[PDB]
Design an enzyme around this catalytic site. Structure first.
Site, short mmCIF file in Angstrom:
data_model
loop_
_atom_site.label_atom_id
_atom_site.label_comp_id
_atom_site.label_asym_id
_atom_site.label_seq_id
_atom_site.Cartn_x
_atom_site.Cartn_y
_atom_site.Cartn_z
N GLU A 60 43.08 45.45 34.97
CA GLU A 60 43.95 44.62 34.18
C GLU A 60 43.81 43.18 34.67
O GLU A 60 43.63 42.94 35.87
CB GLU A 60 45.40 45.10 34.30
CG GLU A 60 46.38 44.34 33.41
CD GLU A 60 46.18 44.55 31.93
OE1 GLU A 60 45.53 43.70 31.30
OE2 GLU A 60 46.68 45.57 31.39
N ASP A 88 44.46 50.19 34.23
CA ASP A 88 45.00 49.04 34.91
C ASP A 88 44.33 48.89 36.28
O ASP A 88 44.04 47.81 36.69
CB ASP A 88 46.52 49.17 34.99
CG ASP A 88 47.26 48.90 33.68
OD1 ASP A 88 46.83 47.98 32.95
OD2 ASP A 88 48.29 49.56 33.44
N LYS A 114 53.16 56.99 26.75
CA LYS A 114 51.88 56.62 27.39
C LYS A 114 50.98 57.84 27.53
O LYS A 114 49.79 57.74 27.32
CB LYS A 114 52.09 56.03 28.79
CG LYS A 114 52.45 54.54 28.80
CD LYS A 114 51.41 53.62 29.42
CE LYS A 114 51.38 52.25 28.78
NZ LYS A 114 49.99 51.76 28.63
#
Ligand SMILES: Cc1cc(=O)c(O)c(C(=O)O)o1
Ligand SMILES: [Mn+2]
Ligand SMILES: [Mn+2]
Length: 178
Positions: A60, A88, A114
């Site tokens: 990320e 991420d 998620k």
């Protein structure tokens, strides 16, 4: 006010990265101020999580060329399956990708949302709220207690700074950025 809060409570690299990402997708940080706050918040958590090892590879916060370059490179050297979506972080200790979630809803709710988005990925999920709750796949929380504590303190602190400025109510009832 929200715009001011963001520039005044997050580190310039983070604000700049958040801002850039929004502008490239034709979103205005001055208008989508809750989204801006959410992007900065999530970015900071990812960086904080990274800076607790070189245990972790930060994905990320990079541009997509660099992000996929890091991913392909990890995949080639470890054999681990390529994800469809950019996660991420990578954890070179547990040898799994991590997806980090930061939510103003209940952690189990965001966890499901998620987990459903990236089901059929072997990606580890770790969800944080602004209440000090977390949820992680297999209740494996990856980090030690001190690191976890530091992220939760920072999240709660953002929450309370928002409330100091009467911004928290807007922010909490929004989901933009999740
Ligand atoms: C909306 C959202 C939530 C995340 O947690 C995330 O990592 C991303 C991302 O990497 O694009 O997007
Ligand atoms: Mn991400
Ligand atoms: Mn994330």
């Amino acid at each position: 006010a929200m715009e001011d809060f963001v520039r005044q409570c997050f580190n310039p690299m983070i604000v700049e990265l958040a801002e850039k990402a929004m502008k490239e997708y034709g979103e205005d940080p001055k208008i989508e101020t809750n989204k801006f706050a959410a992007i900065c918040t999530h970015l900071e958590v990812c960086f904080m999580y990274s800076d607790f090892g070189h245990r972790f590879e930060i994905i990320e916060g990079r541009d997509r060329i660099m992000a996929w370059t890091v991913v392909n490179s990890i995949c080639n050297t470890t054999g681990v399956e390529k994800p469809k979506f950019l996660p991420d972080l990578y954890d070179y200790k547990e040898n799994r990708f991590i997806e980090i979630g930061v939510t103003r809803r209940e952690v189990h709710i965001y966890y499901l949302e998620k987990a459903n988005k990236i089901k059929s990925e072997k990606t580890h999920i770790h969800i944080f709220s602004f209440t000090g709750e977390e949820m992680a796949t297999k209740a494996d929380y990856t980090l030690d207690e001190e690191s976890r504590a530091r992220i939760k303190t920072r999240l709660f602190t953002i929450r309370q700074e928002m409330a100091s400025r009467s911004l928290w109510d807007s922010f909490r009832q929004s989901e933009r950025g999740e």
